[PDB]
Amino acid sequence: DYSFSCYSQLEVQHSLTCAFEDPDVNTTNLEFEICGALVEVKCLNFRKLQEIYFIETKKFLLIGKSNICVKVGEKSLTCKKIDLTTIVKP
Amino acid sequence: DIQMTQSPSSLSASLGGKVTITCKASQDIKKYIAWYQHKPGKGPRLLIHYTSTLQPGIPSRFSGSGSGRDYSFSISNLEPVDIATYYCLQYDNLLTFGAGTKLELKRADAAPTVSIFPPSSEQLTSGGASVVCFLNNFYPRDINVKWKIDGSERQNGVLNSWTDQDSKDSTYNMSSTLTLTKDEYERHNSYTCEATHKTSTSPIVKSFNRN
Amino acid sequence: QVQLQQPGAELVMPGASVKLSCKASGYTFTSYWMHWVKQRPGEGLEWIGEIDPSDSYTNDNQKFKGKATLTVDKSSSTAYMQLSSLTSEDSAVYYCARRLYSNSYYYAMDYWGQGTSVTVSSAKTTPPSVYPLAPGSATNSMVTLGCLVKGYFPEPVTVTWNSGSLSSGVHTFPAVLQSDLYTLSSSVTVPSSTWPSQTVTCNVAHPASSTKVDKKIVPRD
Ligand SMILES: *[C@@H]1O[C@H](CO)[C@@H](O)[C@H](O)[C@H]1NC(C)=O
Numbered sequence A: 001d002y003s004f005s006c007y008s009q010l011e012v013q014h015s016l017t018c019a020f021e022d023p024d025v026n027t028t029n030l031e032f033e034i035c036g037a038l039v040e041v042k043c044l045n046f047r048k049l050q051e052i053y054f055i056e057t058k059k060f061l062l063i064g065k066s067n068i069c070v071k072v073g074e075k076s077l078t079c080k081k082i083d084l085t086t087i088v089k090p
Numbered sequence B: 001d002i003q004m005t006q007s008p009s010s011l012s013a014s015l016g017g018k019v020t021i022t023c024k025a026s027q028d029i030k031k032y033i034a035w036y037q038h039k040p041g042k043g044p045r046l047l048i049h050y051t052s053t054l055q056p057g058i059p060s061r062f063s064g065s066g067s068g069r070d071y072s073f074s075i076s077n078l079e080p081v082d083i084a085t086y087y088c089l090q091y092d093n094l095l096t097f098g099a100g101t102k103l104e105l106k107r108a109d110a111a112p113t114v115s116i117f118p119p120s121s122e123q124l125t126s127g128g129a130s131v132v133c134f135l136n137n138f139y140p141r142d143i144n145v146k147w148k149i150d151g152s153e154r155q156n157g158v159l160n161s162w163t164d165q166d167s168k169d170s171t172y173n174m175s176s177t178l179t180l181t182k183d184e185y186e187r188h189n190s191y192t193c194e195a196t197h198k199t200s201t202s203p204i205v206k207s208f209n210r211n
Numbered sequence C: 001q002v003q004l005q006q007p008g009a010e011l012v013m014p015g016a017s018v019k020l021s022c023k024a025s026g027y028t029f030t031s032y033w034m035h036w037v038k039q040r041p042g043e044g045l046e047w048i049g050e051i052d053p054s055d056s057y058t059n060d061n062q063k064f065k066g067k068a069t070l071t072v073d074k075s076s077s078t079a080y081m082q083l084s085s086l087t088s089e090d091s092a093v094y095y096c097a098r099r100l101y102s103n104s105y106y107y108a109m110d111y112w113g114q115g116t117s118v119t120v121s122s123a124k125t126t127p128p129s130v131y132p133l134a135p136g137s138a139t140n141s142m143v144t145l146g147c148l149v150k151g152y153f154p155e156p157v158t159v160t161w162n163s164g165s166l167s168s169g170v171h172t173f174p175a176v177l178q179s180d181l182y183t184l185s186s187s188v189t190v191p192s193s194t195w196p197s198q199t200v201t202c203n204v205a206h207p208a209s210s211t212k213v214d215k216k217i218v219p220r221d
Helices: none
Strands: A004-009 A015-020 A030-035 A043-045 A047-049 A052-056 A065-072 A075-083 B004-007 B010-014 B018-025 B033-038 B044-049 B062-067 B070-076 B085-090 B102-106 B113-117 B129-138 B144-149 B152-154 B158-162 B172-180 B191-196 B204-206 C003-005 C017-025 C034-039 C046-052 C057-060 C068-073 C078-084 C093-099 C109-111 C129-133 C142-152 C158-161 C182-191 C201-206 C211-216
Touching: A004 A065, A030 A052, B004 B085, B010 B018, B018 B085, B033 B062, B044 B062, B044 C109, B085 B102, B113 B191, B113 B204, B113 C142, B129 B144, B129 B191, B129 C142, B129 C182, B144 B172, B158 C182, B172 B191, B172 C182, C003 C093, C017 C034, C017 C093, C034 C068, C046 C068, C057 C068, C078 C093, C129 C201, C129 C211, C142 C158, C142 C201, C158 C182
Parallel strands: B010 B102
Antiparallel strands: A004 A015, A015 A052, A030 A043, A030 A065, A047 A052, A065 A075, B004 B018, B018 B070, B033 B044, B033 B085, B062 B070, B113 B129, B129 B172, B144 B152, B144 B191, B158 B172, B191 B204, C003 C017, C017 C078, C034 C046, C034 C093, C046 C057, C068 C078, C093 C109, C129 C142, C142 C182, C158 C201, C201 C211
C-alpha cells in the first residue's frame, strides 16, 4: 500500500507536508491532493520535491478533518482524513 | 441553505419545441450546479452537471448555461419521453434543490371518455355502496366532475383521483368515487356524473337508472 | 449498468428506530460516495447527508442531527441510514444515490435509487377489499372495466390485469387516504367482441398484509 504521515506548520504561512512511509515508491506521475477546509476551490494539488509533497497556502479553513488523497492521473489511489491542528511538528 | 429559486413552477410547450428553466442562487455557487430529471414513480436521473457538461447517454438536445448566481437549462426538439419534473442542485457548500418544473406536452384537444359503474353485489352486502365515474384520455387537464342523485348535486362523499401525463398519447385520466351506504343508495334511482370540459359546450352527462 | 436497490416501502410505528438499506452493484464500493435525499409527498428534494465508504466519514445536514446516522458495511457493499425517534413528520420517500467520482466534500450525484416510501403511523395493518366494476345493463366498439380497492392500510398495493398480461389501457390511480384507509381504482379498456369471450381479471396484491385478491369481471345474467 501507499500510506503516508503528514505534518503541518502554523503558529499564526500555513504549510502542510507529506512524506511517503513506503520505502521504495516510484513517486512518479502520482500527486497528492488536499480537499475540504479550503476557501475558493474544493480541492488543491500539492507540489513535489525529492520525495516529499508540500502545500503552502493561507487559504486553509483549519476546521474539521481534511481529506488528503493520492491521484495517478484522474483516478484516486488512496485517501485519509486528518485534522490539521493535530499534525504539528515540534 | 443557499436558496435556489427555480422558475417557472410549471410550463408546457408543443411537440418538437424548446423549453427553458432558470435557477437563481442566493449567493455565488461558482458554477457548481446540476439539473435532474424526475419521472413519476422512478428515481431521478442526472442530465447536466457543472452548468453545461452533459452525461454519457444524454442526448445533445439538453443544453445548459449560466454564471455565478443565474443559470439556465433548455430542452430542444421536445419528444414525448420528456414528460417529467426538473430540479436544480447547488454543491458549493450544501445541496439545495429547486422548486421543480412540471413539463407538459401540448397535444390536440381530446374529448374525455366517460364510464359509469354501479356498486358490486359483494359491496352492497357489507353496508356500502360506491358509484365510480372514470374519465379517460382528455386534454387539457382542466376537468370538473359533479355527482347528481335525482337532480340533487351531492357534495359530501366524493373521492377524486387524477393521473399524470403519460408519455404515450400525452393525455390524462381521472376517477371519481361517490361512496354511500346501502340504505341511502337503495332509496334513490338516478346517479349521474356530469363532466365539464373544454371540448364540449354542454356537459358530458352519463348516468344509469337503478329501476 | 449501476444498480442501487432499496426496499420499496416500510411501515414502522413512531417512537422506534429503523435502518434503511441501499445495496450497490456494478462498481467498486470504496471508490464512490453515497448521498441520501428525503422527499415529502408534495414537497421537493432535501439532502440529508453523505457518507464516505473508505473510512465512514460523514458530512450531514444539520437539520437531521440525531435523527439520521449514515453507516456503511463494506463487505456486503451496502450503505445504511438509521432513523431514530420516528414521528409523523418523518413519513417521506428516502432515495439513495451514488456520488460522482471526486475527493471533494460537497458534490452532486448521477445515478439514483428507487426510494423507500416510509409511512409512519400507529394504525393497524388492514388487508384490501376488492370489488369489480362491470358496465351493468348498459353496445359500441370498446368497453371499459374497473376495479375498486377500498379499506386497506398501509401502502403500497400492486394492481395488475391478467397477472400482467394486460398493460395497454391500464390506469392505476394514486390512492387517497380517508379515515386512515386508502382507496385505489384501476381501469382497462378492451374491444367489444373481446371481453365476453376473453375474460379480464383484476389482481390486487398487498405485501404488508400478505394478501392477493383476484376478481373476474362478469356483466349480468
Ligand atoms: C516508474 O514507472 C514507469 C512506468 O510504469 C517506469 O518506466 C519506471 O522505470 C518506474 N520507476 C522506476 C524507478 O523503476
